[PDB]
């Protein structure tokens, strides 16, 4: 920054807020966050989704990149969740709205639920 | 008070800015961020800060100012420097004493800063 | 090409550097051989160089010796012991005699060896020739840097002294395991 | 000119290069001569330093040489177990006592060697002189050694470790093809 | 200058290379001296570096030595059967013993001689020490390398197997219409 | 790479140093091995170079050495008392003989051994072939010269003359802290 | 690392020095070891170079030796009185036999040594094998140097040749206060 | 640091050079040691570079030296008399054998030694073991080397062939005034 | 009396200030520094000092002044040389005559003042 932006610019700034890189923790608070989102989407389709605590951890550990950010998280989730559910709300069962549920196998597959 | 930081001239096409080169200026007549000021306030105090940090080519065109006292603008006009007084900064000359040395006792690394 | 060149990129690097001096700069010293004075010499300046770069960070002492002369090894323990940042030891290959000496000496908590080393530890040895007054002149010292060796492996390994001084009486060799249990190192690298 | 110089071509380079620093850059390193405790001290920098620079590609070693001291062969052994990315041995010429040890430490499928190599193997050698007490000390060092190379001869070729045992009193010699057959190598390269 | 460097331009510079990396840009490699370890692993290293930069032109190796060791040897013609381009072998001063075992190597059609030149051939040597159970494996050993060396002879040179095995039996000098009758080259080189 | 590089950065930041030059520049000096006429006279080089660079900074001398030659040693001796500023003396391994004798010589108040090093004193050694009469001249010179160091001796550390002359009469051994107590060193540097 | 660099400014500052070129831009030239050929054939080059850099300035030349080859030590004797600057000889360590010779030959009022440093003189060393007529003959030629080697003595310390010729029958060793009185040098220095 | 560098300043003012090349660019050549084919061979080239830098000046000869071969002299000594320069030529030290002999080649008018020098001449040695019938052969040859260096000192120095002869007989030893009335050189120099 | 001094020309970059840059490159509305002055003053002395420093590249110049009286500017314009009295100052030859030859016999040191 300091190579970037000349005295002049800098000094008349409040001040410079650093940002910092995101923890695993912080990681599972995101997971979350998103979660809630996709329920919001679903609910527009009257489908309602119960993700387990496991798949939840499972999820924060699979997208953890400390030097990516939150990012991968959404890709993470967009391409664990989203993608079967869009074919069953296109294709299947979840045409007509429904239930759907994630659980964690200890072959660490998300068993997704049946309608 | 005229001034000017030197680290925002330490690049060789923001020298020409300054100076009021005929090509590489300011606007159309700017010209010649240096000349301008000197001519709207020819009694003035001129203040180049920090500069170690300058453009070489704005150390000549200093040099040469020292020398004859004028600046030509990219139009013609010139600047009169008889009546004003440069002051130059630079925070180099400590900057040496703030390093620790290497050994199993560690000494004094105060120098002359006006050797520096 | 005894030693081979590196290259790397920087700021407008280029630079080369023999792959030695590439890894000092990284913070990486190697100790090899017979530990005699031009050696243990050239390795004070190396630690006393990093320790002035950076007093924060830790130095990796690659430690792979047979063995060789106290006096010389002593002026490494010194400085390893004076020097602000921590120095880590890893030993490959063995650690035999003064070598096994400098390596318990790194940092706690930080010593570690590979799987497939050895070390050995063992009284020193010395003599001398002249007039029978000169004989006890020379036989009391070595008898007390026996005695202040034994010392220092005591309260590196954490060990008794009695027990330190009975097992010095002869060679004692030790698989990188038993260097664990027995207190010489603290842990064992596996893979990365 | 022992080692010639050889011009390479990027965005600014040129660059010239000593012919085997030249292919260092290509993840090669040879390994020739001896087998002895300053020369492996070096080819062990040169494997971490190739490690760094690309965890994700394999490293090359290329193996002609006679046999060496086994402390120094194991230094070599233990850096390309730890190390991420798999080495792959080729052998050349001849790969006898611990060079056909190291030959075999690679990674597994990645073994290879050409057509008119020789491989031979045995038991290691040692001595000492001193009072009966000190030799027996020094002789039971030297059969834990054996039986440690037995094992992991027979882990890394597939034999039982009987086979090996048997196999390694007095010296054995086996060309390419008795190589693959045996477990040592996975193939033998024959034209591009 | 105990070596001759010269001075070239192509473009930018100049450029100032030994003389004898100017000659192995032009695709030239010397083999003088004894065959041993540390000059064979040197040859096949520049044989591998010019393979690669142009894999579609020949690559020609002058000899000019008395003779060395097997091995280092072998490793040497593995190379050239395995890489690509064809391997022309020029002999000039001397081709003895296993000098001229590879200038027979080379590739067919291509193999001169310069007229005041001798190759001579002859089989191995070698010698042991030991029990009469050691002796017994390393005398096999031998005799399994005369008798590969004599297959490749054969192959060729186009002789016989039995014909090759007489003719070795003793030291046998030939001159260079010699060596050209024979079929150990195709041709003599005379003036340009 | 037996001395390995070091990179400083300063204004252009590009210069490269022998880790030893690197030391100099910061007023390090280190002595050590034997004494004799070409390595003293490098150290005497030093000095002055040092002595013209700043006539006012402190010198800092490494001292780990076994002994040497009175003559050559004296060049030093008499160099460190000539030259403006002090020179700080540092003991580290061992001062022994002439070792010591110079390690006494540094500035008062800065003299200082690293806590586990040793320092030896005795008469010095001497010999001669020939006739009677020249036997006397020789004789009368090393005479002369063990009267001298023993008055030096003495200026240095505080001891009376007839204590400095029983003292060296046998090889007298001294530990860091006996020697701060006796008068050769001021203090033991224990941790940054 | 022998020699250590040393880094001065100019104008670019590209400036990097063996110690010893340093100091010889100082004007300083040091002699030390045997005086032989070899080496007393480069003080000459450095003199003659020095003398024209700067013809009216003064030339500093450190003598530290035991002694050594008469026709060598004269080379340098001879050029010393040829050229125009003055050279002030100082004494450290020893300056015995031919080594005192060339110091006492030095500027008049410029001959200086240090405090400790000890002269030593005595008449000219040598020896045949032959008929007795070629013996006779190079018996003639070595008492001709005696006697040129007492003039010279006789002209630079002001003492009368009978004197000279009583004094070095016998190797005579004089202390530095001993050479100031007898006329060898001028003063001692003590401190800068 | 065994020879140091100088610098010197033309327009840019980037000139490092060794000391001995920083006196060949002025012309000025020494001839030390003992006389061989390889270092005659470096001072003839020596010598034609500078005949062909510019043919119109002057060529400085220093010698000091022991004697030589005759064979690799006497290529100094044509090339001496062939080039276009005048060669001068300056004794110091001294100039035996072949050196004196190689001194008085110079220009003429231009021969000159330094007032402490010395110069010796004699007949030329050799020997051979051999068949009566070879040692004949070589005994010839000897002769007639001593009849043509003798026609060649009478040549230069102008004293009659057979006074000449008979001063060669036995070693025999000139001073510098007695060479200068001999004939061998024109004249001392004494001071600038 | 125009003054320039060739200290500040000894890269090849500079050349170009004196004539003026090319069409299409930062730098072409300098009409060219010298070549400006003499254009505005075809009446006057031209004074370059230390011309033992200029970058080869400038000698080039010259030359074409030297002989036939003009340079031509970026924008095709002649300046003019033809009333004008150039001279060049240097101290070339200078380290070439007060000193003299190494060696025990002096060589002539006065016919130099002409190879340098």
């Known amino acids: 920054i300091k190579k970037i932006f000349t005295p002049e610019f800098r000094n008349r700034l409040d001040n410079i807020i650093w940002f910092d890189h995101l923890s695993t923790d912080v990681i599972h608070q995101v997971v979350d966050k998103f979660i809630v989102e996709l329920?919001?989407?679903?609910?527009?389709?009257?489908?309602?989704?119960?993700?387990?605590?496991?798949?939840?951890?499972?999820?924060?550990?699979?997208?953890?990149?400390?030097?990516?950010?939150?990012?991968?998280?959404?890709?993470?989730i967009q391409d664990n969740l989203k993608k079967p559910l869009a074919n069953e709300l296109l294709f299947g069962s979840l045409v007509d709205g429904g239930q759907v549920t994630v659980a964690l196998d200890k072959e660490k597959n998300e068993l997704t639920y049946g309608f | 008070l005229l001034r000017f930081d030197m680290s925002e001239y330490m690049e060789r096409h923001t020298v020409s800015r300054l100076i009021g080169a005929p090509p590489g200026y300011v606007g159309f007549d700017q010209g010649?961020?240096?000349?301008?000021?000197?001519?709207?306030?020819?009694?003035?105090?001129?203040?180049?800060?920090?500069?170690?940090?300058?453009?070489?080519?704005?150390?000549?065109?200093?040099?040469?100012?020292?020398?004859?006292?004028?600046?030509?603008?990219?139009?013609?006009?010139?600047?009169?420097?008889?009546?004003?007084?440069?002051?130059?900064?630079?925070?180099?000359?400590?900057?040496?004493?703030?390093?620790?040395?290497?050994?199993?006792?560690?000494?004094?690394?105060?120098?002359?800063?006006?050797?520096? | 090409?005894?030693?081979?060149?590196?290259?790397?990129?920087?700021?407008?690097?280029?630079?080369?550097?023999?792959?030695?001096?590439?890894?000092?700069k990284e913070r990486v010293i190697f100790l090899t051989g017979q530990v005699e004075d031009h050696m243990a010499n050239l390795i004070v300046a190396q630690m006393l160089f990093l320790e002035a770069e950076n007093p924060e960070k830790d130095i990796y002492l690659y430690?792979?010796?047979?063995?060789?002369?106290?006096?010389?090894?002593?002026?490494?323990?010194?400085?390893?012991?004076?020097?602000?940042?921590?120095?880590?030891?890893?030993?490959?290959?063995?650690?035999?005699?003064?070598?096994?000496?400098?390596?318990?000496?790194?940092?706690?908590?930080?010593?570690?060896?590979?799987?497939?080393?050895?070390?050995?530890?063992?009284?020193?040895?010395?003599?001398?020739q002249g007039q029978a007054t000169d004989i006890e002149i020379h036989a009391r010292e070595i008898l007390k840097v026996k005695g202040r060796m034994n010392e220092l492996m005591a309260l590196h390994t954490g060990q008794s002294l009695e027990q330190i001084e009975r097992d010095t009486e002869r060679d004692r060799f030790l698989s990188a395991p038993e260097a664990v249990e027995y207190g010489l190192v603290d842990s064992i690298l596996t893979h990365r």
Not at chain 2, 51 to 79: S, Y
Not at chain 3, 7 to 13: D, F, L, V
């Open chain 1, 39 to 76: 329920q919001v989407q679903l609910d527009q389709k009257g489908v309602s989704l119960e993700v387990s605590q496991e798949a939840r951890n499972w999820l924060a550990e699979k997208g953890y990149d400390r030097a990516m950010g939150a990012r991968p998280m959404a890709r993470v």
């Open chain 2, 32 to 116: 010649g961020l240096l000349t301008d000021a000197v001519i709207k306030h020819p009694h003035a105090v001129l203040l180049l800060d920090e500069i170690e940090k300058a453009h070489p080519d704005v150390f000549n065109i200093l040099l040469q100012v020292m020398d004859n006292g004028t600046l030509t603008d990219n139009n013609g006009r010139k600047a009169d420097f008889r009546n004003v007084v440069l002051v130059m900064t630079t925070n180099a000359g400590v900057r040496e004493t703030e390093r620790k040395s290497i050994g199993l006792i560690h000494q004094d690394n105060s120098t002359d800063a006006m050797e520096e």
């Open chain 3, 63 to 128: 430690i792979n010796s047979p063995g060789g002369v106290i006096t010389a090894g002593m002026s490494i323990y010194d400085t390893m012991q004076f020097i602000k940042p921590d120095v880590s030891t890893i030993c490959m290959g063995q650690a035999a005699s003064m070598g096994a000496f400098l390596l318990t000496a790194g940092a706690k908590g930080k010593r570690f060896c590979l799987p497939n080393s050895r070390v050995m530890i063992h009284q020193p040895l010395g003599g001398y």
């Open chain 3, 1 to 24: 090409a005894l030693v081979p060149m590196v290259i790397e990129q920087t700021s407008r690097g280029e630079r080369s550097f023999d792959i030695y001096s590439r890894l000092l």
